[PDB]
Design an enzyme around this catalytic site. Structure first.
Site, PDB file in Angstrom:
ATOM      1  N   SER A  67      27.040 105.623  44.287  1.00  0.00           N
ATOM      2  CA  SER A  67      26.856 104.585  43.282  1.00  0.00           C
ATOM      3  C   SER A  67      25.690 103.643  43.535  1.00  0.00           C
ATOM      4  O   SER A  67      25.088 103.140  42.580  1.00  0.00           O
ATOM      5  CB  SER A  67      28.139 103.750  43.155  1.00  0.00           C
ATOM      6  OG  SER A  67      29.120 104.435  42.409  1.00  0.00           O
TER       7      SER A  67
HETATM    8  C1  LIG Z   1      30.034 105.156  43.110  1.00  0.00           C
HETATM    9  O1  LIG Z   1      29.827 105.575  44.231  1.00  0.00           O
HETATM   10  C2  LIG Z   1      31.408 105.254  42.503  1.00  0.00           C
HETATM   11  N1  LIG Z   1      32.391 105.886  43.376  1.00  0.00           N
HETATM   12  C3  LIG Z   1      33.074 106.934  42.940  1.00  0.00           C
HETATM   13  O2  LIG Z   1      33.274 107.143  41.756  1.00  0.00           O
HETATM   14  C4  LIG Z   1      33.517 107.780  43.860  1.00  0.00           C
HETATM   15  N2  LIG Z   1      34.675 107.631  44.340  1.00  0.00           N
HETATM   16  O3  LIG Z   1      35.310 106.390  44.334  1.00  0.00           O
HETATM   17  C5  LIG Z   1      32.919 109.156  43.910  1.00  0.00           C
HETATM   18  N3  LIG Z   1      31.867 109.625  43.103  1.00  0.00           N
HETATM   19  S1  LIG Z   1      31.673 111.086  43.410  1.00  0.00           S
HETATM   20  C6  LIG Z   1      32.755 111.521  44.391  1.00  0.00           C
HETATM   21  N4  LIG Z   1      32.930 112.673  45.030  1.00  0.00           N
HETATM   22  N5  LIG Z   1      33.575 110.424  44.511  1.00  0.00           N
HETATM   23  C7  LIG Z   1      31.910 103.858  42.140  1.00  0.00           C
HETATM   24  N6  LIG Z   1      31.866 103.089  43.385  1.00  0.00           N
HETATM   25  C8  LIG Z   1      32.899 102.556  44.065  1.00  0.00           C
HETATM   26  C9  LIG Z   1      32.560 101.609  44.954  1.00  0.00           C
HETATM   27  O4  LIG Z   1      31.351 101.323  45.062  1.00  0.00           O
HETATM   28  O5  LIG Z   1      33.408 101.021  45.662  1.00  0.00           O
HETATM   29  C10 LIG Z   1      34.167 102.947  43.844  1.00  0.00           C
HETATM   30  C11 LIG Z   1      35.337 102.303  44.454  1.00  0.00           C
HETATM   31  C12 LIG Z   1      35.799 101.218  43.828  1.00  0.00           C
HETATM   32  C13 LIG Z   1      35.160 100.629  42.592  1.00  0.00           C
HETATM   33  C14 LIG Z   1      36.019  99.393  42.302  1.00  0.00           C
HETATM   34  N7  LIG Z   1      37.004  99.542  43.365  1.00  0.00           N
HETATM   35  C15 LIG Z   1      38.109  98.590  43.298  1.00  0.00           C
HETATM   36  C16 LIG Z   1      38.950  98.705  44.560  1.00  0.00           C
HETATM   37  C17 LIG Z   1      40.394  98.580  44.099  1.00  0.00           C
HETATM   38  N8  LIG Z   1      40.413  98.964  42.673  1.00  0.00           N
HETATM   39  C18 LIG Z   1      39.021  99.109  42.195  1.00  0.00           C
HETATM   40  C19 LIG Z   1      36.850 100.539  44.229  1.00  0.00           C
HETATM   41  O6  LIG Z   1      37.528 100.865  45.190  1.00  0.00           O
HETATM   42  C20 LIG Z   1      34.528 104.063  42.904  1.00  0.00           C
HETATM   43  S2  LIG Z   1      33.529 103.941  41.472  1.00  0.00           S
END
Ligand SMILES: *C(=O)[C@@H](NC(=O)/C(=N\O)c1nsc(N)n1)[C@@H]1NC(C(=O)O)=C(CC2=CCN([C@@H]3CCNC3)C2=O)CS1
Length: 622
Positions: free
Chosen positions: A374
């Site tokens: 991300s």
């Molecule tokens: C970017 O990296 C995104 N991450 C993901 O979608 C992934 N898993 O979580 C992923 N993409 S591909 C693959 N194989 N898996 C977004 N980024 C983050 C982040 O930066 O932390 C995510 C985690 C996340 C977003 C908001 N969060 C809150 C914590 C409790 N509830 C929401 C959180 O953990 C996932 S989206």
């Protein structure tokens, strides 16, 4: 131009050639008998001279010129020539040799004399050859503090003969294993080693102690992967390079090995002719030793010691830079190994330990290529913004967690985590909405996406002394898929960028869209790449990146407790990796990039960043 003259002209040459080939005995066969007006020594006595002197100085590559052979009497011709030769210490140039030959029954031979070893030798003259190895230079951080230095170390050891007999030994071994804090059994494996005689000093740590010269790394494992370690020189190393002495150490990994020439210096030496008592009579060569150069880096040893400690030993990496110049303030990788144990002695156990640790301490993770996740979205947006594709305010309406362009994507779904149902650009980065980004990417298409990416540094190799494959967009020169075009838009797919390469691309947000290449040598000039993205795309994104922190739902809200100006984006990928990007949008004095390979439950790169961010925030401003 006489057939006896050139017979002698040929007898000199066959003598010189025999010495090049090192056939000191063939040479000795061309010696007149030992007599008052012929040779001065026997065949065997001559053979020994050349082996002693020409061998011990490794005389080879003997080139003569201006050879002259003139008649003196029917049985004696006088010769003279110039010569140059290669010795183990340098080249001998403009030597002047002279002598006489003995014609007797169509047999032409040399009346050997010591002045055919070297011109100025006489009678019982001898030769001396002394060598002085140089001192390895230092590797220094930006502030002069030492990262790799050679000094005296308080080596601890014991003597089996000053211990106990029975219970006094196995209970005294206890006492010295305590006051120094080392295992008690290892004192027994060491004392019973093969080479031990009960009188020798046996070393233990870096009961008597002796001062030893060694190579020392103050930061130990906290900078072991970058700086590296050095090892005993082996016969094989000398095959690869015969200029090395058997007694030094040599760089084997990290910067020690990358700069081994500069750091290791040049050996000094002196080739002299002496009388029969070692009293110097003429110096033929003298090369004063030249020690090794110091090397000053951009590193800030506190940032490095802090950045490594912050990972608490979990697999990961941290990288900090002053983005407006490229200075690399720290290159942390964890887990790690003890570079001092490796260089100066490491037990057979502590060594087998590192080798089998499955998270691989010896890997310089800050040069390993990863899929950034991300965090990458801050680029994709900046490209979309550059080419008109993205309207900051165009509000997409997005329902649920899964998505796809149409049913022709089979089961390949873009997933998110926060069901926000009205997403504009700002909201997309605050929540890390893969879907919004996956969409606005396809709206842009490979041509306009690569048009922006190709303005970065994929493929390029940086001007750094760290081995690392370059960063790639995909495993082929085209995506050949929509799904991959999308996956890549939100930081996955076939992307590979390593923590140093990431830190370079993201510098655009600290330089109004200019990319500034990373810098690791303290003096080298900054190098940049202007207009990689638009100044306006920066002024759009950065204020959104502040809100990844401030906004109560920001992915990195926990960092607002600190009270320091931060603009940042986070990441996560699936075993689960964790990412963080962060820098100072008020003054642009620092920038950091931290990963966590194979995270633990509820652990994260964001939860470990504060301590390093507070230091950087205070010590790096304008
Ligand atoms: C970017 O990296 C995104 N991450 C993901 O979608 C992934 N898993 O979580 C992923 N993409 S591909 C693959 N194989 N898996 C977004 N980024 C983050 C982040 O930066 O932390 C995510 C985690 C996340 C977003 C908001 N969060 C809150 C914590 C409790 N509830 C929401 C959180 O953990 C996932 S989206």
């Amino acid at each position: 131009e006489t057939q006896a003259v050139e017979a002698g002209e040929k007898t000199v040459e066959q003598f010189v050639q025999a010495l090049n080939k090192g056939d000191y005995n063939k040479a000795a066969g061309m010696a007149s008998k030992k007599a008052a007006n012929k040779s001065a020594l026997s065949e065997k006595e001559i053979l020994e001279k050349y082996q002693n002197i020409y061998g011990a100085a490794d005389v080879k590559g003997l080139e003569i010129s201006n050879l002259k052979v003139d008649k003196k009497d029917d049985s004696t011709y006088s010769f003279s020539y110039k010569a140059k030769m290669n010795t183990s210490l340098g080249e001998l140039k403009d030597l002047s040799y002279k002598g006489t030959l003995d014609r007797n029954d169509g047999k032409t031979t040399i009346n050997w004399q010591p002045n055919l070893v070297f011109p100025e030798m006489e009678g019982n003259d001898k030769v001396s050859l002394t060598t002085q190895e140089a001192t390895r230079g230092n590797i220094l951080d930006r502030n002069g503090e030492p990262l790799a230095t050679t000094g005296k170390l308080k080596q601890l050891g014991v003597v089996p003969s000053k211990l106990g007999d029975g219970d006094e030994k196995t209970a005294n071994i206890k006492a010295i294993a305590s006051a120094f804090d080392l295992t008690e059994d290892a004192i027994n494996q060491a004392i019973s080693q093969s080479w031990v005689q009960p009188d020798y000093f046996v070393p233990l740590k870096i009961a008597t102690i002796q001062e030893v010269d060694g190579r020392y790394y103050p930061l130990g494992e906290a900078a072991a992967q970058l700086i590296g370690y050095v090892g005993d020189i082996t016969a094989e190393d000398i095959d690869k390079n015969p200029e090395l002495s058997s007694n030094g150490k040599i760089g084997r990994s990290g910067l020690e090995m990358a700069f081994d020439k500069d750091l290791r210096g040049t050996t000094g030496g002196k080739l002299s002719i002496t009388d029969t008592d070692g009293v110097e009579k003429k110096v033929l060569i003298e090369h004063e030793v030249q020690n090794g150069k110091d090397i000053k880096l951009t590193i800030d040893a506190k940032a490095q010691k802090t950045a490594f400690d912050s990972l608490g030993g979990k697999a990961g990496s941290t990288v900090a830079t002053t983005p407006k110049t490229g200075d690399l303030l720290a290159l942390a990788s964890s887990p790690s190994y003890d570079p001092n144990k490796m260089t100066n002695g490491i037990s057979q156990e502590d060594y087998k330990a590192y080798e089998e640790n499955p998270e691989q301490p010896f890997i310089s993770r800050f040069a390993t290529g990863y899929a950034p996740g991300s965090t990458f979205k801050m680029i994709t947006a900046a490209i979309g913004l550059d080419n008109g594709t993205i309207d900051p305010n165009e509000v997409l309406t997005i329902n649920g967690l899964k998505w796809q362009k149409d049913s022709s994507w089979g089961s390949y779904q873009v997933t998110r985590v926060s069901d926000v149902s009205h997403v504009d650009l700002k909201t997309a980065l605050i929540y890390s909405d893969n879907i919004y980004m996956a969409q606005e990417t396809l709206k842009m298409g490979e041509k306009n996406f690569r048009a922006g990416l190709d303005k970065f540094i994929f493929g390029e190799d940086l001007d750094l002394p760290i081995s690392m494959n370059p960063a790639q967009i995909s495993n082929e020169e085209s995506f050949n898929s929509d799904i991959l075009l999308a996956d890549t838009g939100y930081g996955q797919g076939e992307l590979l960028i390593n923590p140093i390469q990431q830190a370079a691309m993201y510098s655009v947000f600290a330089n109004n869209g200019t990319l500034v290449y990373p810098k690791l040598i303290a003096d080298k000039e900054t190098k940049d790449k202007k207009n990689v993205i638009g100044e306006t795309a920066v002024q759009t994104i950065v204020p959104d990146l502040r809100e990844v922190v401030q906004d109560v739902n920001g992915t990195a809200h926990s960092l607002s407790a600190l009270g320091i100006p931060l603009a940042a984006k986070t990441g996560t990928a699936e075993k689960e990796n964790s990412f963080l990007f962060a820098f100072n949008p008020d003054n642009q004095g620092y920038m950091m990039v931290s990963m966590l390979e194979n995270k633990e439950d509820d652990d994260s790169a964001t939860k470990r960043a504060p301590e390093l961010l507070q230091y950087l925030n205070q010590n790096y401003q304008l």
